[PDB]
Amino acid sequence: VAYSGRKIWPQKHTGRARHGDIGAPIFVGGGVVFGPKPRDYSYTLPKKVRKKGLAMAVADRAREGKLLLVEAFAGVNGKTKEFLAWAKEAGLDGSESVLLVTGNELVRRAARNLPWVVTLAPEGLNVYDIVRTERLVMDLDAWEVFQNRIG
Amino acid sequence: MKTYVPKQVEPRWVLIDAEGKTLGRLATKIATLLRGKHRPDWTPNVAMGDFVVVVNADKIRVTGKKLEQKIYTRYSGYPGGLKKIPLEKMLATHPERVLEHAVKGMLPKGPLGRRLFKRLKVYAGPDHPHQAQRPEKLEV
Amino acid sequence: AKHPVPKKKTSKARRDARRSHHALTPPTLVPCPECKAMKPPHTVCPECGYYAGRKVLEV
Amino acid sequence: MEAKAIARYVRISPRKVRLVVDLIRGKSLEEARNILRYTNKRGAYFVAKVLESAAANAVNNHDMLEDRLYVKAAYVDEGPALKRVLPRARGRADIIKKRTSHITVILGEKHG
Amino acid sequence: MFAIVKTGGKQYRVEPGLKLRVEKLDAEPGATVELPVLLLGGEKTVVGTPVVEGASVVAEVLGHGRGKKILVSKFKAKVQYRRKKGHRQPYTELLIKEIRG
Amino acid sequence: PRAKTGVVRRRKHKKILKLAKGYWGLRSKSFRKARETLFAAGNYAYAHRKRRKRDFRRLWIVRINAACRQHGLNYSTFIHGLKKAGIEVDRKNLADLAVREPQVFAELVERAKAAQ
RNA sequence: CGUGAGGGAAAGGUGAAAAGAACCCCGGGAGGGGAGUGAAAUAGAGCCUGAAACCGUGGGCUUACAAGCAGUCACGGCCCCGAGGGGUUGUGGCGUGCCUAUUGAAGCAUGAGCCGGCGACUCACGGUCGUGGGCGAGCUUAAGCCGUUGAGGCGGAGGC
RNA sequence: GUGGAGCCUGGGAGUGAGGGCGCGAGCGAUAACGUCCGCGUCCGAGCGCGGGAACAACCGAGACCGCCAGCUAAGGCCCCC
RNA sequence: GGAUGACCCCAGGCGGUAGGGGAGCGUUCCCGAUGCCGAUGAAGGCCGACCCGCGAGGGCGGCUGGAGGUAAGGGAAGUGC
Ligand SMILES: [Mg+2]
Ligand SMILES: [Mg+2]
Ligand SMILES: [Mg+2]
Ligand SMILES: [Mg+2]
Ligand SMILES: [Mg+2]
Ligand SMILES: [Mg+2]
Ligand SMILES: [Mg+2]
Ligand SMILES: [Mg+2]
Ligand SMILES: [Mg+2]
Ligand SMILES: [Mg+2]
Ligand SMILES: [Mg+2]
Ligand SMILES: [Mg+2]
Ligand SMILES: [Mg+2]
Ligand SMILES: [Mg+2]
Ligand SMILES: [Mg+2]
Ligand SMILES: [Mg+2]
Ligand SMILES: [Mg+2]
Ligand SMILES: [Mg+2]
Ligand SMILES: [Mg+2]
Ligand SMILES: [Mg+2]
Ligand SMILES: [Mg+2]
Ligand SMILES: [Mg+2]
Ligand SMILES: [Mg+2]
Ligand SMILES: [Mg+2]
Ligand SMILES: [Mg+2]
Ligand SMILES: [Mg+2]
Ligand SMILES: [Mg+2]
Ligand SMILES: [Mg+2]
Ligand SMILES: [Mg+2]
Ligand SMILES: [Mg+2]
Ligand SMILES: [Mg+2]
Ligand SMILES: [Mg+2]
Ligand SMILES: [Mg+2]
Ligand SMILES: [Mg+2]
Ligand SMILES: [Mg+2]
Ligand SMILES: [Mg+2]
Ligand SMILES: [Mg+2]
Ligand SMILES: [Mg+2]
Ligand SMILES: [Mg+2]
Ligand SMILES: [Mg+2]
Ligand SMILES: [Mg+2]
Ligand SMILES: [Mg+2]
Ligand SMILES: [Mg+2]
Ligand SMILES: [Mg+2]
Ligand SMILES: [Mg+2]
Ligand SMILES: [Mg+2]
Ligand SMILES: [Mg+2]
Ligand SMILES: [Mg+2]
Ligand SMILES: [Mg+2]
Ligand SMILES: [Mg+2]
Ligand SMILES: [Mg+2]
Ligand SMILES: [Mg+2]
Ligand SMILES: [Mg+2]
Ligand SMILES: [Mg+2]
Ligand SMILES: [Mg+2]
Ligand SMILES: [Mg+2]
Ligand SMILES: [Mg+2]
Ligand SMILES: [Mg+2]
Ligand SMILES: [Mg+2]
Ligand SMILES: [Mg+2]
Ligand SMILES: [Mg+2]
Ligand SMILES: [Mg+2]
Ligand SMILES: [Mg+2]
Ligand SMILES: [Mg+2]
Ligand SMILES: [Mg+2]
Ligand SMILES: [Mg+2]
Ligand SMILES: [Mg+2]
Ligand SMILES: [Mg+2]
Ligand SMILES: [Mg+2]
Ligand SMILES: [Mg+2]
Ligand SMILES: [Mg+2]
Ligand SMILES: [Mg+2]
Ligand SMILES: [Mg+2]
Ligand SMILES: [Mg+2]
Ligand SMILES: [Mg+2]
Ligand SMILES: [Mg+2]
Ligand SMILES: [Mg+2]
Ligand SMILES: [Mg+2]
Ligand SMILES: [Mg+2]
Ligand SMILES: [Mg+2]
Ligand SMILES: [Mg+2]
Ligand SMILES: [Mg+2]
Ligand SMILES: [Mg+2]
Ligand SMILES: [Mg+2]
Ligand SMILES: [Mg+2]
Ligand SMILES: [Mg+2]
Ligand SMILES: [Mg+2]
Ligand SMILES: [Mg+2]
Ligand SMILES: [Mg+2]
Ligand SMILES: [Mg+2]
Ligand SMILES: [Mg+2]
Ligand SMILES: [Mg+2]
Ligand SMILES: [Mg+2]
Ligand SMILES: [Mg+2]
Ligand SMILES: [Mg+2]
Ligand SMILES: [Mg+2]
Ligand SMILES: [Mg+2]
Ligand SMILES: [Mg+2]
Ligand SMILES: [Mg+2]
Ligand SMILES: [Mg+2]
Ligand SMILES: [Mg+2]
Ligand SMILES: [Mg+2]
Ligand SMILES: [Mg+2]
Ligand SMILES: [Mg+2]
Ligand SMILES: [Mg+2]
Ligand SMILES: [Mg+2]
Ligand SMILES: [Mg+2]
Ligand SMILES: [Mg+2]
Ligand SMILES: [Mg+2]
Ligand SMILES: [Mg+2]
Ligand SMILES: [Mg+2]
Ligand SMILES: [Mg+2]
Ligand SMILES: [Mg+2]
Ligand SMILES: [Mg+2]
Ligand SMILES: [Mg+2]
Ligand SMILES: [Mg+2]
Ligand SMILES: [Mg+2]
Ligand SMILES: [Mg+2]
Ligand SMILES: [Mg+2]
Ligand SMILES: [Mg+2]
Ligand SMILES: [Mg+2]
Ligand SMILES: [Mg+2]
Ligand SMILES: [Mg+2]
Ligand SMILES: [Mg+2]
Ligand SMILES: [Mg+2]
Ligand SMILES: [Mg+2]
Ligand SMILES: [Mg+2]
Ligand SMILES: [Mg+2]
Ligand SMILES: [Mg+2]
Ligand SMILES: [Mg+2]
Ligand SMILES: [Mg+2]
Ligand SMILES: [Mg+2]
Ligand SMILES: [Mg+2]
Ligand SMILES: [Mg+2]
Ligand SMILES: [Mg+2]
Ligand SMILES: [Mg+2]
Ligand SMILES: [Mg+2]
Ligand SMILES: [Mg+2]
Ligand SMILES: [Mg+2]
Ligand SMILES: [Mg+2]
Ligand SMILES: [Mg+2]
Ligand SMILES: [Mg+2]
Ligand SMILES: [Mg+2]
Ligand SMILES: [Mg+2]
Ligand SMILES: [Mg+2]
Ligand SMILES: [Mg+2]
Ligand SMILES: [Mg+2]
Ligand SMILES: [Mg+2]
Ligand SMILES: [Mg+2]
Ligand SMILES: [Mg+2]
Ligand SMILES: [Mg+2]
Ligand SMILES: [Mg+2]
Ligand SMILES: [Mg+2]
Ligand SMILES: [Mg+2]
Ligand SMILES: [Mg+2]
Ligand SMILES: [Mg+2]
Ligand SMILES: [Mg+2]
Ligand SMILES: [Mg+2]
Ligand SMILES: [Mg+2]
Ligand SMILES: [Mg+2]
Ligand SMILES: [Mg+2]
Ligand SMILES: [Mg+2]
Ligand SMILES: [Mg+2]
Ligand SMILES: [Mg+2]
Ligand SMILES: [Mg+2]
Ligand SMILES: [Mg+2]
Ligand SMILES: [Mg+2]
Ligand SMILES: [Mg+2]
Ligand SMILES: [Mg+2]
Ligand SMILES: [Mg+2]
Ligand SMILES: [Mg+2]
Ligand SMILES: [Mg+2]
Ligand SMILES: [Mg+2]
Ligand SMILES: [Mg+2]
Ligand SMILES: [Zn+2]
């Protein structure tokens, strides 16, 4: 704290409480006791745990009938309205939130600005994103790499 | 069901002839009569006892040698101001007070106990001035 | 001396009970027989300058 | 109908003035004026003026009749205090509060 | 006529038309119950020894409730012992139907 | 994140002060003095519920006594007699009788004199 | 503030917009009362909200024969709201502040004028028990590298 | 003898200023609201409740809450009560 | 008893300082949330003799206030004077 270390007044005989300096947390304007300092909240969750979590996350959406794999994306070539077309053809009105996993950039860029769509490259597949969304939509290309990461 | 509480009732006047009675033994009974504890609707927080006229206080009686040995005592608040008055002398100078002081000490202390002492009227000699209330002559 | 000092803060009730004698009494006034104005008795009327039924002082 | 005046921030002490205000509560306008005139106190000046402003309002803004007017309410409030140093013996400084008043007079009409 | 009846460990003087709260009775609201009798009074006088044999008072149960909350508080000095408990005693509300003497 | 006192403390003092409404001087005005007063009031309360059960019984007893000595016996003899008779009317109810229904009470007196 | 080295504060908020109140009235002024502006002026500049201590006016109840840790329990009177509640308190019963420190405090032992806000068991890395899970004669990566731009993976050196 | 009994392995303590009373001793003066031990008890922590005028440790008794119900304990029952 | 916190019946325990253990209340912040409550009135402030909870509290309603607030379930602390 910015203040100095001087004893503001003598120890005895003033008729006031004894104090040292005004950096003491007991003073308004003094330093704070056990406040936060910078911290690293990260830790190494076991790899196998992450893997099972990734398996189960997808498996859950499968049991729900919510997992859908697609072969390709028709005429969607970067324009959002194109995705919306394709969406409809596959049952995606947007009454349900979707996690779209594909390596095709132009599909991701199209679908991205939507409120109800989250977009991922397959190496980015992760369980928080899986649980967040009501429906899982994966390119075959993606499903293959998801396969590699879990076995 | 909550306990009965009387409405303010008319107090009976009562007459007692103190002649020849024992000082303290008369006293307890006057106190009881003053509280009103002889009344089934007794209530401790209101003045509802009887009024008591007493005559012949000067001819009250006491046992043992207390005539010369009962000392009544009074402190004035000044240094050396504790006067001592033997029973004999109190009879001879303010006889009615012997009975009064005895009764006073047997009533509860506090504002209510002090008003019940007022309801007691003590006379030396055969007579009193309370004809107007036509007091009922009790035995005790 | 040993610097006497109050032992307890005085209650609102007791400070105000000390003040139970502090009320001002209204000034005592009588009409002036000439100009009817209210004035202290036994003083020269400061409105019209009369006292004792004659003009005494220039108001 | 009522008419009022308030003198806010008068540099006199609330407790002192109230003494004077106590004299006029419930008097006719004529009586209070008389009383104030011969009250040997500083605050009688200030109360006089708050009164006269109120009577002005009553007559001139509120269709009341000067000759029906009476002090229906009057009260003194305490405003912000002025803090000043009063230097004492042996290096010590005391702090004097120079106190302040918000003076109010409220006039009504006495019917009949 | 009145009757002295005994319910919930306590006794009460009751009469036709009387509303009474007593310790909660195990009885559906609207139902009817017979209270034991210790003494009948008024015109005739019969003294129970302790109860009277033929007698009973009928009561229609109006319903059950919880009383106004009492704050039961505890405190011990120089020990930091303090407790605050809230209490509402259950009751049953009865109307006295008849004194079957 | 920092959690200042904010709103919480005021609301705790108010709770107390309301409970203290009606107390003299600072005892309804200062939070601290209220709390002292309320500890007393709480132990006084609890104790006085207990004590109230006693207090009334003692009044019931004094009352039964007066109406007993109207028929030539004392409370102590009375209670003995009812006891032998098997009359279990409580002192609360006896008292109502002694004032409200003096005939019925006299009867109870009768039975108690009989029972010994 | 200190000779000096040096110490070292307090102090944010009208309104959407100044539309910041022409003009008249009392006043020396301050201040106010009207008029006016504004959705709002106890938003009027001593300006969002406006708690508490604290001071005041008005109203109900109450108090000048009364003995008190100030309450509580009972009853009665008066006042308010409409077989009930609320306020007040005459009488009666009971009744030794809080905290701290102590063998023991109402204690004539400590601390506290009162109110508001600040104010004291934390975090990192190791360790040891317990616990929720992953794998199991196995378990696990560190720095780093790649990818993301709040996406995760690789990395077996090493540790148990 | 099934008890907030007992034993074993581990985690967390606090305490390591006691005090009155009864009995058995030493010290002192067959002194101290004295001191130091032994067995016990209560207070400590039961300064909650009844009795002892008032009073931690004497007598009665181990307070979960509510009731305008009943029986008792010590102690009491002429009035205060 | 039903079958595993569904509730019911019966029985016992429930004074407490140091201290051990258990279960909760609330404050700031994050996920829930491109959501939802909000000018037909956010937060906060002042009331209530009303409701729910053993309690810490949580509702509801009237007045003030004038633009924010944030659920079920979880996460993290500058968390209660
Ligand atoms: Mg520094
Ligand atoms: Mg500096
Ligand atoms: Mg420095
Ligand atoms: Mg330094
Ligand atoms: Mg130094
Ligand atoms: Mg220094
Ligand atoms: Mg010193
Ligand atoms: Mg000092
Ligand atoms: Mg000081
Ligand atoms: Mg100091
Ligand atoms: Mg110092
Ligand atoms: Mg310091
Ligand atoms: Mg220092
Ligand atoms: Mg410092
Ligand atoms: Mg420092
Ligand atoms: Mg700082
Ligand atoms: Mg600063
Ligand atoms: Mg700073
Ligand atoms: Mg701090
Ligand atoms: Mg620190
Ligand atoms: Mg520090
Ligand atoms: Mg830290
Ligand atoms: Mg860092
Ligand atoms: Mg950690
Ligand atoms: Mg790390
Ligand atoms: Mg979403
Ligand atoms: Mg999106
Ligand atoms: Mg007699
Ligand atoms: Mg009594
Ligand atoms: Mg004489
Ligand atoms: Mg006496
Ligand atoms: Mg007494
Ligand atoms: Mg001297
Ligand atoms: Mg001197
Ligand atoms: Mg000298
Ligand atoms: Mg001096
Ligand atoms: Mg002093
Ligand atoms: Mg004061
Ligand atoms: Mg006052
Ligand atoms: Mg005084
Ligand atoms: Mg004249
Ligand atoms: Mg004068
Ligand atoms: Mg004029
Ligand atoms: Mg001062
Ligand atoms: Mg000053
Ligand atoms: Mg029963
Ligand atoms: Mg019940
Ligand atoms: Mg204690
Ligand atoms: Mg204490
Ligand atoms: Mg105490
Ligand atoms: Mg304590
Ligand atoms: Mg202690
Ligand atoms: Mg305590
Ligand atoms: Mg409490
Ligand atoms: Mg704060
Ligand atoms: Mg704080
Ligand atoms: Mg607060
Ligand atoms: Mg608090
Ligand atoms: Mg608040
Ligand atoms: Mg609160
Ligand atoms: Mg009061
Ligand atoms: Mg007060
Ligand atoms: Mg006061
Ligand atoms: Mg106040
Ligand atoms: Mg109780
Ligand atoms: Mg008691
Ligand atoms: Mg009992
Ligand atoms: Mg007899
Ligand atoms: Mg018996
Ligand atoms: Mg019996
Ligand atoms: Mg210097
Ligand atoms: Mg200088
Ligand atoms: Mg310096
Ligand atoms: Mg400073
Ligand atoms: Mg600053
Ligand atoms: Mg603004
Ligand atoms: Mg602005
Ligand atoms: Mg002008
Ligand atoms: Mg002018
Ligand atoms: Mg002007
Ligand atoms: Mg004006
Ligand atoms: Mg103006
Ligand atoms: Mg307008
Ligand atoms: Mg509007
Ligand atoms: Mg306002
Ligand atoms: Mg405003
Ligand atoms: Mg201001
Ligand atoms: Mg604003
Ligand atoms: Mg303001
Ligand atoms: Mg203000
Ligand atoms: Mg205020
Ligand atoms: Mg007043
Ligand atoms: Mg007298
Ligand atoms: Mg009087
Ligand atoms: Mg006394
Ligand atoms: Mg009574
Ligand atoms: Mg009452
Ligand atoms: Mg009432
Ligand atoms: Mg009392
Ligand atoms: Mg006691
Ligand atoms: Mg005391
Ligand atoms: Mg004591
Ligand atoms: Mg305290
Ligand atoms: Mg403390
Ligand atoms: Mg302390
Ligand atoms: Mg000490
Ligand atoms: Mg010491
Ligand atoms: Mg000592
Ligand atoms: Mg004292
Ligand atoms: Mg003292
Ligand atoms: Mg000292
Ligand atoms: Mg002290
Ligand atoms: Mg010391
Ligand atoms: Mg000071
Ligand atoms: Mg104060
Ligand atoms: Mg404070
Ligand atoms: Mg720790
Ligand atoms: Mg572990
Ligand atoms: Mg694993
Ligand atoms: Mg190692
Ligand atoms: Mg045990
Ligand atoms: Mg054990
Ligand atoms: Mg066992
Ligand atoms: Mg631990
Ligand atoms: Mg240790
Ligand atoms: Mg220790
Ligand atoms: Mg020692
Ligand atoms: Mg030792
Ligand atoms: Mg020892
Ligand atoms: Mg021991
Ligand atoms: Mg002793
Ligand atoms: Mg012996
Ligand atoms: Mg011995
Ligand atoms: Mg020995
Ligand atoms: Mg000798
Ligand atoms: Mg010793
Ligand atoms: Mg000895
Ligand atoms: Mg010895
Ligand atoms: Mg011992
Ligand atoms: Mg200790
Ligand atoms: Mg004991
Ligand atoms: Mg023990
Ligand atoms: Mg006693
Ligand atoms: Mg005792
Ligand atoms: Mg005792
Ligand atoms: Mg004891
Ligand atoms: Mg027990
Ligand atoms: Mg009941
Ligand atoms: Mg018995
Ligand atoms: Mg015995
Ligand atoms: Mg005795
Ligand atoms: Mg007796
Ligand atoms: Mg049980
Ligand atoms: Mg248990
Ligand atoms: Mg316990
Ligand atoms: Mg447990
Ligand atoms: Mg909180
Ligand atoms: Mg919580
Ligand atoms: Mg913040
Ligand atoms: Mg943040
Ligand atoms: Mg959001
Ligand atoms: Mg939002
Ligand atoms: Mg809406
Ligand atoms: Mg609007
Ligand atoms: Mg509104
Ligand atoms: Mg909030
Ligand atoms: Mg907030
Ligand atoms: Mg609330
Ligand atoms: Mg609000
Ligand atoms: Mg905004
Ligand atoms: Mg939230
Ligand atoms: Mg939540
Ligand atoms: Mg979560
Ligand atoms: Mg802190
Ligand atoms: Zn003249």
CSV table of C-alpha atoms (C1' of nucleotides) in Angstrom, one decimal, chain I residues 1 5-7 9-10 17-18 22 24 28 32 39 41 43-45 49 52-53 61-63 65 76 78-79 81:
chain,number,residue,atom,x,y,z
I,1,G,C1',-44.9,-51.2,9.0
I,5,G,C1',-36.5,-40.3,2.6
I,6,A,C1',-43.4,-41.3,0.7
I,7,C,C1',-45.4,-41.1,5.3
I,9,C,C1',-47.4,-46.2,14.5
I,10,C,C1',-44.8,-47.2,19.0
I,17,U,C1',-18.2,-23.2,28.8
I,18,A,C1',-13.5,-25.1,26.1
I,22,G,C1',-24.0,-32.7,11.2
I,24,G,C1',-29.0,-25.2,6.6
I,28,U,C1',-20.8,-10.7,-4.2
I,32,G,C1',-28.2,-21.7,-16.9
I,39,A,C1',-42.4,1.9,-17.3
I,41,G,C1',-42.6,0.1,-12.6
I,43,A,C1',-32.8,-2.5,-7.5
I,44,G,C1',-32.8,-0.1,-3.1
I,45,G,C1',-35.7,2.6,0.8
I,49,A,C1',-51.7,-6.9,13.4
I,52,C,C1',-44.5,-20.1,4.8
I,53,G,C1',-40.0,-21.8,7.8
I,61,G,C1',-49.5,-6.8,-0.1
I,62,G,C1',-49.6,-0.8,0.3
I,63,C,C1',-46.4,3.6,-0.1
I,65,G,C1',-38.2,4.8,-6.1
I,76,A,C1',-16.3,-19.8,-7.1
I,78,G,C1',-12.5,-9.8,-0.6
I,79,U,C1',-19.3,-13.7,2.4
I,81,C,C1',-19.8,-7.2,13.4
